[PDB]
């Protein structure tokens, strides 16, 4: 449905004019959109060292409004690239760009990108709140929980360019308690946050196996590829190496296999014969025999695609008297059991999986603030709306309500903003 208009008097954000001279390799940027008749054309990326980058005015997500004094709102994708390719080398082009319409965002997240974003103005108001006697946490929460994670990356850049000190440093010295734990987590890129939460769970021989299972069993292939890279840049050791250090047994093999992020991508053709054979092989390895063939479970549940395994688990009920989750609760035990239980829940319904973990972190005495904060931070821009939807259906009350009754202060207001809505 993304908003579209052919009249420039109906655009939201601010406007930018540019003059780019065509080089031997073009203007140095790519464009997306343009199939759908009513679809904007937006800058997807800028070739570094190219004309668009070395001019510094063009940014990703910019709606191309007009090219060479000709409005291109509603132009097809092929009609626009013909304008840029008709320009000879050495000649320039006039681009009117609109900043304020977003791009590859998640339809199910709760924290969306601020339209009238001003990284300089935000870093200004944060410093004023940080330096306020009796630190003004209200404004800090009002800004950071209302910006996208990449917008927070720009605020951290602007804050350091003005005060010559890091934003994470100044906020760590000004905040305390659980509010600090939330705000510092919101300032990390999703890979950096996961990479830090993983190392934090392998602090010693007393590994937090719960947090290790949560991050590994829920992250996709593309998310885990980024985690493995960022984890080595930050800690100078492979994520797999620390997992091998602080795990053992079949639980080690299941965590290492999932962390590689080499799961077979979702296929376009449904393999009905493999769905049945995988279902029988899970049954033959577990309930049907004495003991369990754990390697056969790890191979099937980590290598097949998620849409495939969902069909495998439904077909599995045709052979076994107990479904896949109940089969796990009696074939294996311990940390291995907790891993297979979480993995299967992330395959069947991942939003429902995080809804249960939020309920578990708040149902009892006190709060598992560690689990609660990580789920709200990590899932705020991915599927937070689906998490709230499954939560209210199953538990009657909203996720907002359970956070309200279990947390207080500005720490509560930070979590409620990441949850979204007024309830």
């Amino acid at each position: 449905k993304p908003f579209f208009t052919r009249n420039p008097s109906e655009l939201k954000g601010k406007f930018i004019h540019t003059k780019l001279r065509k080089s031997s390799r073009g203007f140095g940027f790519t464009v997306v959109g343009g199939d759908e008749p009513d679809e904007f054309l937006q800058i997807k990326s800028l070739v570094l060292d190219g004309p668009a980058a070395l001019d510094g005015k063009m940014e990703t997500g910019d709606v191309i409004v007009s090219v060479n004094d000709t409005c291109v709102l509603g132009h097809t994708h092929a009609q626009v690239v013909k304008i840029f390719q008709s320009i000879p080398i050495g000649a320039s082009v006039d681009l009117e760009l609109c900043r304020g319409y977003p791009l590859g965002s998640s339809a199910y997240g709760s924290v969306k990108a601020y339209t009238n974003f001003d990284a300089e103005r935000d870093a200004l108001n944060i410093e004023t709140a940080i330096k306020t006697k009796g630190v003004d946490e209200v404004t800090i929460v009002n800004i950071l929980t209302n910006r996208s994670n990449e917008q927070r990356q720009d605020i951290a850049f602007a804050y350091q360019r003005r005060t010559k000190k890091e934003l994470a440093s100044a906020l760590k010295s000004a905040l305390s308690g659980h509010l600090e734990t939330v705000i510092l987590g919101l300032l990390k890129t999703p890979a950096q946050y996961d990479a830090s939460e993983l190392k934090a769970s392998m602090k010693g021989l007393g590994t937090d196996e719960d947090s290790l299972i949560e991050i590994i069993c829920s992250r996709t292939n593309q998310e885990l590829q980024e985690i493995n890279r960022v984890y080595k840049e930050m800690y100078k050791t492979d994520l797999e190496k620390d997992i091998i250090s602080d795990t053992s047994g079949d639980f080690r093999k299941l965590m290492v296999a999932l962390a590689k992020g080499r799961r077979a991508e979702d296929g376009s053709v449904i393999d009905y014969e493999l769905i049945d054979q995988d279902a029988r092989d899970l049954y033959d390895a577990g309930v049907k025999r004495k003991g369990t063939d754990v390697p056969k479970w790890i191979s099937i549940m980590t290598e097949r695609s998620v849409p495939h395994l969902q069909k495998v688990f439904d077909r599995y009920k045709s052979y076994s008297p107990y479904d896949m989750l109940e089969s796990i609760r009696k074939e294996v035990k311990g940390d291995l059991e907790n891993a297979f239980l979480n993995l299967v829940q992330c395959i069947q319904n991942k939003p429902l999986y995080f809804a249960d973990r939020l309920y578990d972190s708040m149902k009892g005495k006190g709060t598992r603030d560690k689990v609660l904060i990580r789920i709200m931070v990590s899932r705020s821009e991915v599927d937070m709306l689906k998490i709230r939807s499954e939560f209210k259906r199953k538990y009657g009350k909203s996720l907002y309500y359970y956070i309200q009754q279990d947390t207080k202060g500005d720490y509560q207001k930070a979590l409620l903003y990441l949850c979204g809505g007024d309830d």
């Binding site: 790519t30 070739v47 994708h77 390719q85």
Partner: peptide
């Protein structure tokens, strides 16, 4: 998914 370098 239309996408072209310029």
């Amino acid at each position: 998914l239309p996408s072209t370098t310029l």
